[PDB]
Design a binder for these strands. Structure first.
Ligand SMILES: [Mg+2]
Ligand SMILES: [Mg+2]
Lengths: 146, 49, 157, 142, 54, 97, 48, 165, 103, 108, 40, 63, 58, 350, 266
RNA sequence: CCAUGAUAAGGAUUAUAAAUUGAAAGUGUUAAUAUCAUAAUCAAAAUUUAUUAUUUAUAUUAAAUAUGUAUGUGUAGAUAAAAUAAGAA
């Protein structure tokens, strides 16, 4: 994500100081007051709103707004992760049977086949859909890449 | 229609009843609370104009 | 209803919901009720301003009022039935068949710990525990310590 | 429970002869409610103060079509005798009635004037086994 | 009263009964909108082609 | 709550519950800083003013520190208000010496 | 196992399984989440 | 012994000073305090148990007051009393309920947003699926039961149920 | 981010990395009431008496409820005809008619 | 699905072959513990020691939930007593002067 | 101030007394030969 | 009151350990006389199963 | 103990007899504490939050 | 106080896990974090302080604030020149530098082999242990309708635990930004771990002898009787009492007749009322808030309306209600409230 | 062959919409298509269902006194009811009537958000007590019988999701909904500020503030149920000026801003 | 109301040192057999159930309402518990 946005979180503090110093907040360029108002609308909230901001309705409506604009990717309830990453093999032993101690969902750019191993740009030259087998599979993976 | 609308449930059956597999994801602790911060195309237009 | 299209395996689970309303009712009526009692039974002069015949007058008026409330929840808490939010087993609170912190019956508690569902820790069955206070004075003393940190460390204003 | 005397006989277990914390037993049955005391007559199973008002049940709270029995905690009032009206209490098997008025009742609860456990025992509600056992106790003749 | 159309049936006439809610891949319940009034190739029956549109 | 009761319908009443459980505000001051020259030149709190103070507030004093706990209202704002009121009131009386 | 599903947040046997984080692993945060920063939703109340 | 409590007004003394009772009253104005006039002076009892370092049970505070007749019905008890509002009784009231997630959200909502649809409880679903599987061999062990009978008893103008054997 | 052994080969950060803190911090809004700035003074007269929806509400013990008590008295006395409350009896008043009330 | 998480990431070891060395196997009347190791409990204590788990400061041990046994909260790693105390600490100690009680009352 | 402290990334603020991650934990688990002397 | 033999035993052990800290060689006779020795004994933990709460199992009747 | 002036009062009793022979009653029913009643019995110890028993309000 | 023992603002973070080592390791993490954020902030305040020390002006406002006393310690209105005031300011800033350096120096002690975060000398912030919460659940593991005995013999002991580390940071000043990072640490908090925030800061309160005046005891005393149960709800107002800041000048009065009436100097009365050069009969005036004799709202003496010669409506006696409701400027219903006799006999006050 | 619970039912909404609407297919719940709710019940059936479901006090049960049966059978023994007029003779009648079931708005925070002391809980939201229409609470007319069916019934058909809904409510729910359902800006752009029943109060506040009693005026300010007119605030702050109290003036004005629709911006 | 699962109780020979005197073989409530019916505490209530340690002679009912019966030579048969900070050979 883009980090430096946190500096905007500084603002509702600075604003408060302006009141204590007696600098009127209404003398600001209209430009900057728009920018800063947007900053407020990002991070500031009251006690009032905060008691109610976790209503399930509001959460799900946000989910819906995301659905109509077709960004479901990051949401919690609304994504289903499929692909697993397999273990690394040791030359110290093939015999050793590894198994999973813990499992965590992390972005694929941590470990993904190095750029020189895979075919050239896959986004442009290959149309790939991850999909489920319709038949019963007796063993192996129930998700294959088409 | 929309390809990220993808079944969150397995086909209804007795596996739901006879197994300890849970029916939902557990809450993610570090997921922020979804809240509304933002503007419309209409509002941006108004401000610029 | 009439056992048509019932969702829950145990019908009596519904009682739990009912129970909740009971408690809700109390929140609404408690303050009211108690005031109405306190002003009612009070013999001494109520105050400097309200004394004598005015006092008896007001007292009877208030108890008349309290009586006229229909539906007011006066039932003492220990007379309400505790019931499992899971399997709807019941227990008498203050006995070994009810478990206070999870608010479930012995049956459910057993079921839930043995197959791991609730997270607890086994301790020697015969002792006081891991804990210091209970190790010291038993149930009563830990009770007291609770009273102490909820109330007594504050010097009220 | 062994015999179902009510609805709850299906739901409840007896759990042997089992001890409860002091003064809390789930089902209040006052066997002692009528328990003769000459000297303690005004202090026993009655208002802890003589200066208290009568309970809720000595008054008509709202617009009533009417009632069948008045609750057992309703105190007997001089009007209960004088007025000559039906005074009903829910006891077992069915209902107890104050029929033969007296001033010795006044100022006590009908919780106190109604014997909860009667010495009269119907043998028609008893199993043959039960009747045998009551004979053991030297209650029923045989 | 009740018949093969109203009743719960796994299979009506030697084939899987579509009238039963639980006889479908749950993905079918997932929401969609109506295509037909929009241009021929936006419509979902051409989906495999959608990445190529103009 | 960052954990469980964080994000859904119950988040509201839980949050509120916790805020009303914590509504206590403690208000402290030493009695060494109450002994200072007031704007009229009198010493604000002197020996007898302190004696009268200490007897006035009984257990509300310890270790030469006055501490008032205001629980009266559901929210911390009103308890700072209530607390300051009781403080200035107690000083008002104790100054009578 | 039952008609009442195990709520996966409370149940250790879920939490501490091989498909989640056991208590002896080091308990840090797995991945950051910027939700409200990436795509932001404008405010429309259901009430006017 | 038995005596009449007494008070010497500061004007009467051969040096004026603040009497301790006076202060007591000042205090009772400031922090509002009920003066219990019928309080017997002979009943002062420290609670031995919790107030003496000698017993293992020592909290340094008067845990209980020792009055044998003390009861919840007394008016004074009601004046210093904690109210059940916003105490644990409430937390129980709201979070302990048969299907836990009905505390977190409306079920219909969640389902309609996640799945496209509302889903039956698992138990209902068991009932149903079995209805299907066993209607597909035997018939007429059955009975037709509903909420409202007026739908089967007068069916609409169409509606000709398919005969079966 | 650059560490390709992260959860796979067993490297799990003991200290949560600066970047991630920056993000988690950047996501949630900051409550405005948490700033705590008072330059005026306490409002003695008005503040506690403010409009009933947003009002300062007493809590716990009944003493703190003084205002409410007044209202509950006034209101009650207004709605309750003495004609009616006449009828409510005290135990001794009733018992005066029992053949032996006093011993 | 929501269950897409709970698939087996790797292939589980098959059970190919016989009971392991000195397994419990049960003839006519035989009291059998699957739990107790056959070989290492039968070993005399004077040799092996009363120790169940490596002897190390118990802050490295946590009592497991659902299992009767303890585990290391840093899995499999161990620090010897020598790394708890300062360098060359007599009877490994915060300081060499006194024991716990001694430190405390000296301080008093 | 800055969101990420200057003392983290700026080499002018570098702390020379700091050690690498691996070194200390390697020297920590060392158990030195306990027969230092004859006789004991 | 701590006067009773068990508490006395404890007291003895205490004084002895002190004395050893003060006069090091004195530790040899003490140890041989079994002063410094600690015995581990406890009342049985409280428990509802037993009548008196400690050692006595409840009454048994043949069916 | 402070007391209301002009009221007739008693002083704590020195002579054991004066205690034993007075009309002071014994606890008979269940006993009540104004605070402790909310967390019900010693055996049911109701707690809203799992705060450390030592926990100190700032 | 110097060094460790003293601060302007103290934050205590109480971290709570389900497992001990969880909260311990958590405490180490959060602690390291606040060590770096702490160093940053305190460093900045240090460079600010050092600049301030190097030189700077003095407020007109601060100067004024030093010079407000009627009489300072030497018994006359004191003149603080801007030099002296700058000298005070400078003293305190020197102290602030001492404390900043203290904190910063502590921050730089805890190196990897040498880290000990429990002792407050060795690191900032430091960490205290807090006793774990432990609840033992005791219950029947048998389901038996048959026998109590058997239920009892089956009894298991299990426990719930909760573990607490406490994090202490004492700071020489109050930064809003530190509070921000600190409240924010709840968002990256460890798995299944929650926290509390205890803030203890210093805040100027203000005692007015104006609103809470210091007065002699009443010439009537207050008895025990004013204190019964519900005397709090009935016989008393909530303090402070309402004193009038506004007063009407009586006829034969002059400036110091009014001033001797209100219990204040003539100068004062002239200054609160500075707008007016002269005070005629029947004019409203501003009572200087330092006046001794200021009146309470609604003195205890009831206003009484005699029937008498009234208006021209009769010139004989007053009759109907709203006539008097116009005379006394109130709603008729109030007047009916007060007089229970005059309400029940009739409305024409026969 | 047909066993139902009720014989007949009715539609939620009327001809004008339905006769046309039926031409557009509505998607029914997939597993249970046919919905019969408590809004579909007839008059009699609803009356009966609202009687049952409250333990003892509720009208359905026979000894509650609201029972309209003239006879009731306890285990083969038939009991004839005692009429109320006869019940009065030994058991004095104290009835305040409707108004004793309703506390003022003042107490509402003490009562955890209710004005209503009735047997069922009364929500000030539209959707919990909703039958076919949105629920509204009459504070004048409250009866044991509850004609409008606005109360929250424990055991009735369809009650479950409602009860859940109640337990899920936000911390200010009762209060907030009571405040917003009444007291809203007029279609004109006119403040709600002018209401007949509360007018003498505002007159009293102003008249008190003018003679310079600030505390008195505020103590009466507390009792105000509706938004007070701008004149009130003018009077209060103008009273605040002479004694120099700033803080109280500011908090007054801050009470009028954004809370009360900015009556105090003037 | 027919409608499978699953956790209790129950001492009989791995011992003393740096150490536990409570066990798997299943005791109402729990997941695939359906085809008579609404039975559930929110107070103040009706003994027949094998499976339970009660206060025994100087002083004796005050707060939720709180037990009126059995003095009989420590007395039939038959039964109960314990080797654990206690003291048994
Ligand atoms: Mg029911
Ligand atoms: Mg079984």
């Amino acid at each position: 994500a883009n980090i430096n946005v946190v500096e905007k979180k500084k603002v509702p503090l600075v604003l408060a100081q302006m009141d204590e110093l007696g600098v009127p907040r209404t003398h600001l360029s209209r430009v900057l007051m728009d920018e800063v108002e947007d900053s407020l609308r990002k991070f500031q909230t009251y006690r009032s709103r905060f008691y109610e901001w976790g209503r399930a309705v509001k959460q799900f409506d946000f989910i819906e707004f995301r659905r109509r604009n077709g960004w479901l990717y990051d949401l919690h309830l609304m994504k289903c992760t499929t692909k697993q990453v397999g273990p690394l093999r040791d030359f110290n032993d093939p015999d050793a049977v590894q198994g999973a101690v813990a499992t965590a969902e992390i972005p694929a750019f941590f470990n993904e086949r190095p750029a020189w191993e895979r075919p050239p740009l896959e986004e442009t030259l290959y149309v790939t859909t991850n999909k489920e087998r319709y038949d019963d599979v007796r063993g192996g993976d129930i998700y294959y890449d088409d | 229609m929309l390809s990220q609308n993808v079944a969150k449930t397995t086909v209804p059956s007795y596996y739901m009843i006879r197994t300890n597999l849970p029916h939902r994801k557990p809450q993610n602790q570090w997921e922020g609370v979804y809240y509304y911060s933002g503007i419309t195309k209409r509002q941006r237009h108004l401000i610029l104009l | 209803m009439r056992h048509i299209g019932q969702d829950v395996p145990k019908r009596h689970t519904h009682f739990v919901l009912e129970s909740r309303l009971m408690y809700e009712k109390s929140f609404r009526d408690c303050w009211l009720h108690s005031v109405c009692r306190a002003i009612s039974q009070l013999d001494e002069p109520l105050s400097k301003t309200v004394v004598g015949t005015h006092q008896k007058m007001l007292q009877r008026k208030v108890t008349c009022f309290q009586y006229n409330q229909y539906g007011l929840f006066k039932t003492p808490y220990y007379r309400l039935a505790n019931v499992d939010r899971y399997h709807a087993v019941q227990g008498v609170a203050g006995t070994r068949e009810w478990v206070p912190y999870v608010n479930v019956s012995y049956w459910t508690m057993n079921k839930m710990v043995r197959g791991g569902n609730l997270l607890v820790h086994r301790v020697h069955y015969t002792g006081w525990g891991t804990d210091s206070h209970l190790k010291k004075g038993g149930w009563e003393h830990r009770w007291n310590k609770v009273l102490q940190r909820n109330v007594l460390q504050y010097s009220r204003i | 429970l062994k015999i179902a005397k009510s609805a709850f006989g299906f739901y409840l277990a007896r759990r042997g002869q089992r001890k409860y914390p002091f003064l809390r037993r789930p089902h209040i049955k006052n066997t002692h409610s009528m328990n003769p005391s000459a000297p303690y007559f005004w202090s026993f199973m009655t208002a802890k103060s003589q200066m208290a008002f009568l309970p809720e049940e000595n008054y008509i709270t709202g617009d009533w079509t009417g009632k069948f029995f008045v609750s057992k905690r309703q105190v007997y009032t001089l009007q209960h005798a004088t007025s000559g009206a039906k005074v009903r209490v829910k006891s077992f098997p069915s209902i107890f009635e104050f029929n033969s008025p007296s001033r010795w009742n006044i100022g006590k609860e009908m919780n106190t004037l109604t014997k909860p456990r009667m010495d009269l025992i119907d043998e028609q509600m008893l199993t043959k086994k039960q009747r045998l056992d009551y004979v053991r106790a030297g209650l029923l003749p045989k | 009263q009740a018949d093969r159309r109203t009743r719960h049936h796994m299979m009506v006439d030697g084939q899987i009964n579509p009238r039963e809610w639980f006889n479908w891949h749950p993905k079918e319940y997932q929401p969609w909108y109506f295509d037909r009034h929009k241009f021929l190739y936006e419509q979902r029956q051409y989906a495999q082609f959608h990445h190529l549109l103009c | 709550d960052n954990l469980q009761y964080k994000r859904y319908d119950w988040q509201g009443w839980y949050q509120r519950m916790l805020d009303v459980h914590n509504r206590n505000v403690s208000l402290r001051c030493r009695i060494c800083d109450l002994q200072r020259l007031d704007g009229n030149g009198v010493q604000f709190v002197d020996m007898q003013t302190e004696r009268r103070l200490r007897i006035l507030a009984q257990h509300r004093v310890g270790m030469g520190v006055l501490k008032l706990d205001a629980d009266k209202y559901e929210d911390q704002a009103d308890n700072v208000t209530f607390g300051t009121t009781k403080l200035s009131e107690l000083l008002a009386d104790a100054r009578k010496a | 196992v039952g008609y009442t599903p195990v709520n996966p947040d409370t149940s250790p046997m879920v939490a501490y399984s091989q498909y989640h984080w056991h208590y002896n692993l080091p308990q840090g945060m797995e991945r950051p989440h910027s939700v409200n920063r990436t795509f932001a939703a404008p405010f429309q109340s259901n009430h006017s | 012994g038995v005596h009449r409590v007494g008070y010497t007004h500061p004007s009467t003394l051969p040096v004026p000073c603040a009497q301790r009772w006076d202060l007591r009253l000042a205090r009772a104005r400031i922090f509002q305090e009920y003066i219990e006039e019928k309080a017997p002076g002979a009943w002062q009892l420290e609670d031995e148990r919790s107030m003496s370092p000698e017993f293992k049970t020592f909290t340094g505070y008067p845990m209980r007051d020792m009055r044998p007749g003390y009861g919840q019905n007394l008016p004074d008890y009601i004046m210093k009393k904690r109210l059940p509002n916003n105490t644990h009784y409430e937390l129980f009231a709201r979070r302990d309920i048969p299907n836990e997630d009905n505390a977190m959200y409306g079920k219909y909502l969640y389902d309609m947003t996640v799945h496209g649809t509302s889903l039956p409880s698992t138990y209902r679903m068991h009932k149903d699926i079995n209805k299907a599987q066993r209607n597909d061999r035997k018939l007429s062990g059955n009975r037709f039961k509903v909420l409202c009978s007026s739908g089967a008893k007068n069916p609409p103008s169409g509606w000709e149920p398919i005969p079966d054997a | 981010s650059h560490r390709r052994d992260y959860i796979r080969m067993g490297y799990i950060p003991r200290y949560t990395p600066w970047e991630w803190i920056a993000i988690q911090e950047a996501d949630q809004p900051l409550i405005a009431e948490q700033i705590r700035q008072d330059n005026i003074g306490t409002s003695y007269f008005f503040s506690l008496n403010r409009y009933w929806r947003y009002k300062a509400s007493p809590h716990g013990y009944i003493r703190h409820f003084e205002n409410e008590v007044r209202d509950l008295l006034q209101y009650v006395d207004g709605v309750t005809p003495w004609k009616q409350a006449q009828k409510i009896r005290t135990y001794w008043e009733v018992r005066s008619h029992h053949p032996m009330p006093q011993f | 699905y929501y269950w897409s998480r709970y698939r087996m990431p790797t292939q589980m070891p098959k059970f190919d072959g016989p009971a392991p060395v000195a397994a419990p196997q049960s003839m006519n009347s035989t009291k059998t513990n699957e739990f107790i190791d056959p070989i290492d409990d039968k070993f005399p204590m004077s040799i092996r020691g009363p120790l169940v788990r490596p002897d190390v400061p118990e802050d490295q041990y946590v009592d497991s939930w659902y299992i009767c046994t303890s585990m290391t909260h840093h899995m499999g790693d161990y620090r010897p007593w020598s790394a708890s105390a300062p360098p060359n600490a007599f009877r490994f100690r915060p300081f060499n002067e006194f024991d716990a009680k001694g430190r405390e009352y000296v301080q008093y | 101030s800055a969101n990420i402290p200057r003392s983290v990334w700026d080499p002018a603020q570098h702390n020379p007394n700091w050690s690498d991650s691996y070194g200390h934990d390697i020297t920590n688990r060392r158990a030195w030969p306990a027969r230092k002397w004859t006789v004991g | 009151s701590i006067a009773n033999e068990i508490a006395a035993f404890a007291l003895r052990m205490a004084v002895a350990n002190a004395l050893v800290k003060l006069i090091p060689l004195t530790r040899i006779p003490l140890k041989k006389s079994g002063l410094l020795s600690v015995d581990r004994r406890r009342e049985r933990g409280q428990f509802p199963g037993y009548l008196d709460g400690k050692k006595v199992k409840r009454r048994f009747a043949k069916r | 103990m402070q007391q209301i002036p002009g009221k007739v009062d008693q002083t704590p009793f020195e002579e054991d007899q004066t205690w034993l022979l007075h009309s002071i009653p014994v606890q008979q029913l269940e006993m009540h504490h104004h605070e402790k009643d909310l967390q019900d019995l010693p055996f049911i110890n109701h707690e809203q939050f799992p705060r450390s028993l030592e926990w100190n309000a700032p | 106080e110097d060094g460790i023992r003293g601060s302007e603002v103290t934050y205590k973070i109480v971290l709570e896990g389900f497992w001990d080592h969880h909260v311990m390791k958590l405490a180490e993490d959060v602690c390291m974090f606040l060590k770096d954020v702490g160093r940053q902030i305190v460093e900045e305040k240090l460079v600010a302080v050092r600049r301030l020390l190097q030189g700077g002006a003095v407020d007109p406002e601060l100067l004024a604030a030093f010079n407000c006393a009627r009489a300072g310690p030497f018994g006359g209105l004191d003149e603080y020149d801007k030099e002296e005031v700058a000298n005070f300011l400078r003293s305190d800033l020197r102290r602030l530098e001492e404390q900043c350096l203290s904190v910063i120096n502590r921050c730089n002690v805890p190196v990897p082999g040498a880290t000990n975060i429990y002792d407050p000398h060795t690191s900032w912030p430091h960490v205290e242990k807090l006793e774990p919460w432990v609840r033992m659940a005791e219950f029947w593991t048998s389901s038996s309708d048959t026998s109590f005995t058997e239920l009892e013999m089956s009894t298991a002991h299990y426990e719930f635990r909760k573990f607490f580390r406490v994090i202490i940071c004492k700071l020489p000043f109050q930064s809003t930004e530190f509070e921000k990072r600190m409240y924010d640490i709840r968002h990256w908090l460890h798995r299944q771990t929650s926290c509390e925030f205890h803030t203890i800061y210093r805040r100027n309160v203000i005692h007015d002898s104006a609103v809470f005046p210091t007065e002699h005891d009443p010439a009537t005393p207050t008895t025990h009787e004013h204190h019964r149960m519900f005397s709090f709800a009935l016989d008393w107002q909530s303090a402070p009492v309402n004193r009038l800041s506004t007063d009407t000048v009586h006829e034969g009065e002059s400036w110091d007749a009014v001033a001797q009436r209100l219990g204040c100097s003539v100068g004062e009365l002239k200054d609160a009322n500075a707008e007016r050069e002269t005070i005629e009969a029947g004019v409203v005036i501003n009572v200087p808030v330092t006046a001794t004799r200021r009146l309470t709202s609604f003195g205890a003496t009831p206003l009484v309306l005699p029937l008498k010669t009234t208006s021209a409506k009769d010139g004989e006696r007053i009759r109907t209600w709203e006539e008097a409701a116009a005379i006394l400027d109130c709603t008729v219903e109030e007047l009916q409230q007060c007089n229970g006799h005059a309400a029940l006999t009739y409305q024409k006050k026969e | 062959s047909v066993s139902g619970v009720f014989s007949k039912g009715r539609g939620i909404g009327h001809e004008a919409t339905t006769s046309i609407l039926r031409y557009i297919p509505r998607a029914r719940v997939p597993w249970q298509p046919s919905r019969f709710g408590r809004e579909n019940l007839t008059a009699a059936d609803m009356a009966r269902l609202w009687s049952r479901g409250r333990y003892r006090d509720g009208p359905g049960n026979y000894n509650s006194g609201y029972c309209t049966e003239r006879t009731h059978v306890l285990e083969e023994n038939t009991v004839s009811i005692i009429p109320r007029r006869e019940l009065e003779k030994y058991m004095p009648d104290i009835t305040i009537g409707p108004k004793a079931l309703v506390t003022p708005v003042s107490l509402m925070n003490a009562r955890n958000g209710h004005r209503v002391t009735h047997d069922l809980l009364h929500s000030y939201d539209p959707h919990i007590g909703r039958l076919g229409k949105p629920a509204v609470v009459d504070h004048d007319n409250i009866t044991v019988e509850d004609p409008n069916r606005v109360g929250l019934n424990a055991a009735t058909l369809d009650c479950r999701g409602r009860i859940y809904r109640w337990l899920r409510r936000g911390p200010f729910f009762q209060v907030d909904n009571y405040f917003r359902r009444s007291v809203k800006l007029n279609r004109d752009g006119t403040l709600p500020t002018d209401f007949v029943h509360e007018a003498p109060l505002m007159r009293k506040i102003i008249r008190l503030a003018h003679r310079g009693h600030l505390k008195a005026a505020c103590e009466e300010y507390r009792r105000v149920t509706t938004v007070p007119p701008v004149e009130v605030y003018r009077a209060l702050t103008a009273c605040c000026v002479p004694g120099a109290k700033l803080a109280d003036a500011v908090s007054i004005f801050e009470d009028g801003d954004s809370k009360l629709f900015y009556v105090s911006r003037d």
